Each structure stands twice: as C-alpha cells, then as structure tokens.
Amino acid sequence: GRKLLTYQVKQGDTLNSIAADFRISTAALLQANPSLQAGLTAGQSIVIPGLPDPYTIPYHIAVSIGAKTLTLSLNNRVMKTYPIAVGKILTQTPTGEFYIINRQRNPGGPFGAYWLSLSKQHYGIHGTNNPASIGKAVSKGCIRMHNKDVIELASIVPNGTRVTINRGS
C-alpha cells in the first residue's frame, strides 16, 4: 500500500496555477488524476505524486495568527511553541489547512537557510536574515521564523506535515 497525500480542490483554481504553486509536474497531476484533463472537480480529493500521507505524520503544526506563534505537537501532544511572523495574507484563512509540498535546503540567499514550501506560495514558512521581523505581523510576507527554528522544524517534521493556520479569532 502506498499512502500518498490527498489535496481537496475547488471550482475556480486553474490547474496550471495548482501545478505551479505546488512545484510539481503538470503531467504528473494528470497521471495520478486523469480526470483533471477533462475538468476540475470541485470537492474532489486529488492525489499528489511525491507527497506522503498527512495523517501518517505524527507531527501537528498549529499556527496561531493572533498569537503569532507556531505550536508543534508531537503525537497530538504539544512539544514546543515558537514565535513566528505572519502577513495580511495569513489572516485571510480562518482554518488554513495546508500541507508541506517540499523543503528547499540551502538556497544560498537570505531566505533563512531553509525554505518550507506549503500548499500556497504566500503561506509558506522560512527563516530570514533579520530575526527582528519575526514575532510581529508583516504587510504581505509569508510565514517567517528564526534561523534555528526553521532548522529544528525541518529536522523534526517531514513532508506532507499538516500545518493548521488558525487565526485564533
């Protein structure tokens, strides 16, 4: 048995945009889900080739927008809580149920050592070159954490990890 990730799509999201945002092959999407080439079925759980099952992952990331913090829960038990930075785009999602699609290791630039690609380019998590910008709200930036925090997270959590971006209010 090969337990893979399952993403739920809606009606309006362009297939090309989905493949691009997910950084995956468009052909692979049609490979796992041959119905996509015909039409976008809203409410259907599509299979993402290369992504593991998000329930098998014994790590739950509970993001709190109003508290600007990331609650890392191991086996449904809170293990650590680190301060994070969120943008106006993060306040949009009330539930924010997203999964990690891939993780970039050492981009060379001021990305913060590591880059965690989520199911949305503006809802992704990464470090930074200025830790003073962490813990507060930013204009239109993505989820930012400390250099050590993202390193710790990338070591504890794998791929497909369920990040729940809750506003808290």
């Binding site: 990305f111 949305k120 992704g124």
Partner: peptide
C-alpha cells in the same frame, strides 16, 4: 500567490 507568490514564494519567499
């Protein structure tokens, strides 16, 4: 959306 986007990225960094």
């Amino acid at each position: 959306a986007x990225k960094x």
